[PDB]
Amino acid sequence: LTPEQIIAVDGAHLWHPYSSIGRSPVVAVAAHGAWLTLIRDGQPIEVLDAMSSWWTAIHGHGHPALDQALTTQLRVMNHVMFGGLTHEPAARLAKLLVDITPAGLDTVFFSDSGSVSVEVAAKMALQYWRGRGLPGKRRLMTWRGGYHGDTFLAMSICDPHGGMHSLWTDVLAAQVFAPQVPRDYDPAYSAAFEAQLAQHAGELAAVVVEPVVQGAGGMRFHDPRYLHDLRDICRRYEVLLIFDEIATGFGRTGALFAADHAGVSPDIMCVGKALTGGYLSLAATLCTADVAHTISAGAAGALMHGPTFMANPLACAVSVASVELLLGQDWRTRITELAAGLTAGLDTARALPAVTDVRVCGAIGVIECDRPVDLAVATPAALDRGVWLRPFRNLVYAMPPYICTPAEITQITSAMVEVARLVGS
Amino acid sequence: GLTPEQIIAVDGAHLWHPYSSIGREAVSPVVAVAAHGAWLTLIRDGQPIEVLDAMSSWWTAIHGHGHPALDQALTTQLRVMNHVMFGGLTHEPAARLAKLLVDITPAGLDTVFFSDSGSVSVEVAAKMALQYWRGRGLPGKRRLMTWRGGYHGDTFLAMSICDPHGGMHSLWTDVLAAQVFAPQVPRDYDPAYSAAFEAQLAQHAGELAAVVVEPVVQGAGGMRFHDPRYLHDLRDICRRYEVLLIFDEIATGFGRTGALFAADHAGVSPDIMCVGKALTGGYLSLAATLCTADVAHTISAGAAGALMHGPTFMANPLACAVSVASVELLLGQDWRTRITELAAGLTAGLDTARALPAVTDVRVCGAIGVIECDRPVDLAVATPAALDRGVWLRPFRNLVYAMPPYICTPAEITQITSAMVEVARLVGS
Numbered sequence: 001l002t003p004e005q006i007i008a009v010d011g012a013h014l015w016h017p018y019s020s021i022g023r024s025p026v027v028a029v030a031a032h033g034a035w036l037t038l039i040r041d042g043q044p045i046e047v048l049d050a051m052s053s054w055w056t057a058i059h060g061h062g063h064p065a066l067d068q069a070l071t072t073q074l075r076v077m078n079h080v081m082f083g084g085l086t087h088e089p090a091a092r093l094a095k096l097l098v099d100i101t102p103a104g105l106d107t108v109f110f111s112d113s114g115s116v117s118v119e120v121a122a123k124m125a126l127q128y129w130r131g132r133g134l135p136g137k138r139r140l141m142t143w144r145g146g147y148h149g150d151t152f153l154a155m156s157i158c159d160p161h162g163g164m165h166s167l168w169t170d171v172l173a174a175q176v177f178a179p180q181v182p183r184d185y186d187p188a189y190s191a192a193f194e195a196q197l198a199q200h201a202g203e204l205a206a207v208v209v210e211p212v213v214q215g216a217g218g219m220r221f222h223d224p225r226y227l228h229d230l231r232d233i234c235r236r237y238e239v240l241l242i243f244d245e246i247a248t249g250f251g252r253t254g255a256l257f258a259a260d261h262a263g264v265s266p267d268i269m270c271v272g273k274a275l276t277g278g279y280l281s282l283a284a285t286l287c288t289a290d291v292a293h294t295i296s297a298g299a300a301g302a303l304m305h306g307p308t309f310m311a312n313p314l315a316c317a318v319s320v321a322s323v324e325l326l327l328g329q330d331w332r333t334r335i336t337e338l339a340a341g342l343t344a345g346l347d348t349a350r351a352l353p354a355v356t357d358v359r360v361c362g363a364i365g366v367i368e369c370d371r372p373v374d375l376a377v378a379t380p381a382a383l384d385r386g387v388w389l390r391p392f393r394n395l396v397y398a399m400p401p402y403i404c405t406p407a408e409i410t411q412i413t414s415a416m417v418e419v420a421r422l423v424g425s
Numbered sequence: 426g427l428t429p430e431q432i433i434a435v436d437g438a439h440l441w442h443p444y445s446s447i448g449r450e451a452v453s454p455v456v457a458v459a460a461h462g463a464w465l466t467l468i469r470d471g472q473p474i475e476v477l478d479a480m481s482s483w484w485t486a487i488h489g490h491g492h493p494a495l496d497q498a499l500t501t502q503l504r505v506m507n508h509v510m511f512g513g514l515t516h517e518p519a520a521r522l523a524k525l526l527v528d529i530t531p532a533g534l535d536t537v538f539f540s541d542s543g544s545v546s547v548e549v550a551a552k553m554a555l556q557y558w559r560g561r562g563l564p565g566k567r568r569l570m571t572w573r574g575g576y577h578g579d580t581f582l583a584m585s586i587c588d589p590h591g592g593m594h595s596l597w598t599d600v601l602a603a604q605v606f607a608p609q610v611p612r613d614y615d616p617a618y619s620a621a622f623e624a625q626l627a628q629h630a631g632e633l634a635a636v637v638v639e640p641v642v643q644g645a646g647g648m649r650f651h652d653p654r655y656l657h658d659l660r661d662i663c664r665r666y667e668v669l670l671i672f673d674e675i676a677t678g679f680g681r682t683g684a685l686f687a688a689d690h691a692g693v694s695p696d697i698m699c700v701g702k703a704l705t706g707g708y709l710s711l712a713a714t715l716c717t718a719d720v721a722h723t724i725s726a727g728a729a730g731a732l733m734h735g736p737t738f739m740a741n742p743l744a745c746a747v748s749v750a751s752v753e754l755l756l757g758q759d760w761r762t763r764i765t766e767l768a769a770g771l772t773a774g775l776d777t778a779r780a781l782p783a784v785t786d787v788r789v790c791g792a793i794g795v796i797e798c799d800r801p802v803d804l805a806v807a808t809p810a811a812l813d814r815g816v817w818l819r820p821f822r823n824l825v826y827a828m829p830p831y832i833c834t835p836a837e838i839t840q841i842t843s844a845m846v847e848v849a850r851l852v853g854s
């Protein structure tokens with residue numbers, strides 16, 4: 001199909017994320033390394049994938065080690081049902097994940113998406129307490145500003161304004177919300193968290209939060225010491241702690257997992273997005289031996305979940321290679337250099353009239369503006385500078401692939417500054 | 426690099442399996458090391474043996490594993506573009522697949538929403554239905570109705586419309602949404618059942634967003650078949666009481682029941698439709714939800730202005746590419762003849778099971794064969810017995826059943842059915 005044919009089919013038949021039908025998307029024809037080939041005015045152009053294709057492409061696109069791992073597995077076994085059978089890609093990836101995740105996370109449940117992995121995490125927590133004779137422990141607690149997925153349980157712990165909990169009035173589970181976690185450490189926030197949690201301890205299965213960085217809820221950072229507090233509160237009140245690392249995982253925040261900034265091990269952990277280096281959909285939910293054994297000795301004798309494509313060989317194979325590629329290099333220095341690039345490149349944005357904040361955490365760079373960013377202005381402006389940038393609400397932000405050179409980062413940040421300049425005029 | 430023994434050891438310590446435990450598994454899982462065509466290579470007594478994939482790897486491998494045309498589709502896309510975000514971008518594999526899917530599904534399904542799994546597509550379908558009525562100023566229309574015996578996924582909303590016994594709702598007291606359940610749909614057509622379904626719906630109509638059913642074949646809820654005419658009655662009931670109709674074709678789609686989609690048996694179109702499982706020919710997780718123009722427009726003109734859903738990997742180019750090849754490969758051959766031949770093979774080969782003491786039923790529908798027994802089938806007896814005969818079979822509850830790849834030869838079906846018959850014999854004693 002020609003680009004124009006793609007556009008016509010797309011307008012008539014394709015739903016996009018969080019969009020309408022009939023209300024225009026740009027045709028993508030190739031991706032290699034940190035670059036996308038986009039069709040603009042009928043002409044192909046090379047642009048930097050500053051978004052990492054939504055947090056996903058940590059090693060860039062078409063990485064030879066990830067391409068090879070995919071075709072190698074494809075020669076041997078595309079997929080087998082995980083009911084009654086096991087295989088090497090599942091075992092290799094499970095061993096990897098157990099070894100590099102915070103200590104005590106010994107078991108691995110594979111699924112096909114972040115939202116599903118979160119539903120699995122919530123299921124683990126509910127079955128765990130049912131295994132302990134305490135079925136009253138069934139609500140969830142989080143702080144505001146969060147995002148945990150699009151499925152209906154997941155939605156219930158998303159920020160009530162963010163995921164607009166009306167028009168979902170009498171539809172979502174009614175969960176417990178503490179106020180927005182602030183950027184700077186404040187003992188009084190944690191004390192209030194504890195006091196509110198104390199009021200619901202007997203009905204709470206778990207606290208679920210994104211550690212250090214809150215992503216789709218507004219690219220906010222908080223002090224990792226709150227995570228230390230969350231761990232202590234959850235211990236003392238016997239509530240499980242769940243870390244949603246679907247966005248933060250695999251080095252993105254400057255640590256291998258964001259939990260590491262605090263030295264904290266959650267009881268349950270979700271990963272996804274960068275898991276496969278952005279080739280294929282995959283997610284994982286990990287829990288402690290204790291959680292696993294308590295579920296398994298319960299009335300059900302099992303975790304009552306099992307996606308059809310569970311532990312798909314092809315997805316697991318590329319993920320193994322993506323993880324090994326990350327571990328086998330000096331990823332910490334890579335991420336540190338990237339953060340300094342973002343920091344230096346975004347400095348001048350602080351002086352712009354419409355800019356309220358500039359913040360960087362690992363390979364995450366954020367220009368917070370004073371009004372919603374108009375995509376009809378922002379997207380073509382960044383395309384003009386040879387960069388794929390998609391703003392969100394009042395945020396001009398980037399999360400570049402790790403393979404981006406210093407020059408490419410500076411090109412990304414320039415385009416971000418120029419986009420921010422345009423919002424102000 | 427891990428050997429079979431190393432794999433078993435890592436797996437027992439660290440891997441969850443579907444609906445399983447950690448550390449309390451009666452039988453260790455079997456190491457699979459290869460899959461080609463209709464055969465899996467599995468490790469038994471430390472030795473690689475080839476056995477028939479009677480299950481199509483849980484309905485997925487319709488064209489079999491490692492099919493040259495699907496392999497090629499995947500490798501070709503890989504050299505060009507692995508993935509891009511579907512926010513603000515579109516691409517050729519998404520367009521091509523959507524166009525195919527719109528053309529080949531029941532008339533009136535004009536828009537396609539891609540996701541990563543069957544359960545997610547069901548939640549999207551529900552979200553479509555609910556947002557639809559909110560767009561009509563009827564936010565009270567928010568509950569779902571179904572008939573018992575069904576399966577729709579394992580995410581929490583999907584769980585709420587699964588059969589209350591099959592889905593173990595007893596373990597979920599006041600966690601799940603309370604939905605409206607009609608009695609088990611009978612095999613044989615009885616208009617009394619439809620009339621009672623309508624009366625039950627009529628009293629809930631003002632609070633129902635949608636009826637959600639598996640058309641013709643209920644899969645994970647007990648492999649039950651029902652007369653297609655019941656779907657014709659649902660369409661009529663939903664039309665007259667203004668309640669949307671959702672067909673869950675995640676198991677039934679793409680030729681499995683002898684028609685392209687199971688709805689085609691009844692000649693009826695749902696308002697919203699889910700597909701998955703066989704979509705990519707079993708290569709990769711991919712699902713879709715389709716809806717009519719009216720559903721799409723009403724959602725879009727509503728207060729929210731958009732469908733509030735968007736999986737990160739939405740419309741993945743690799744998954745979409747292999748799916749296009751899988752759909753085209755099915756459409757490019759006489760698939761209807763193939764499924765008729767398969768069904769005949771399944772019938773002839775399973776017939777002697779009807780006489781078996783422990784067998785209550787033998788039933789075939791397209792490329793699906795089922796032996797229902799009068800008691801649960803012991804996996805520790807059945808699995809070794811089928812392997813011993815060169816067949817991968819996994820019984821469920823009291824059922825011994827198969828959904829073989831469409832590429833199975835008559836001799837392969839003979840071999841599949843013989844193993845099934847035998848498993849059934851051992852259930853006697």
Ligand SMILES: COC(=O)c1c(C(=O)OC)c(-c2cccc(F)c2)n2c1C[S@@](=O)C2
Nearest residue numbers: 081082083306307308309310443444483645
């Ligand atoms: C209640 O349904 C099931 O028990 C089930 C299931 C299963 O039987 O796992 C052994 C499986 C299953 C899932 C993945 C692989 C496999 F061999 C079997 N699945 C289901 C639901 S269908 O969506 C996926």
Ligand SMILES: COC(=O)c1c(C(=O)OC)c(-c2cccc(F)c2)n2c1C[S@@](=O)C2
Nearest residue numbers: 017018054216510511512735736737738739
């Ligand atoms: C409220 O969150 C979102 O709006 C959102 C989103 C999006 O902004 O798509 C336009 C996307 C999104 C999803 C797929 C591709 C893409 F570019 C963006 N996603 C989310 C949720 S994150 O889990 C997936």
Ligand SMILES: *Cc1c(COP(=O)(O)O)cnc(C)c1O
Nearest residue numbers: 113114115148149246247736737
């Ligand atoms: C992206 C994301 C999810 C959802 O993942 P999908 O694969 O899009 O379902 C859930 N939680 C967090 C924190 C995320 O960043």
Ligand SMILES: *Cc1c(COP(=O)(O)O)cnc(C)c1O
Nearest residue numbers: 307308542543544577578675676
């Ligand atoms: C398999 C199935 C689902 C769920 O699909 P997953 O990919 O396992 O989440 C939903 N509905 C029906 C009818 C199915 O057969």
Ligand SMILES: [Cl-]
Nearest residue numbers: 462464475476
């Ligand atoms: Cl052979």
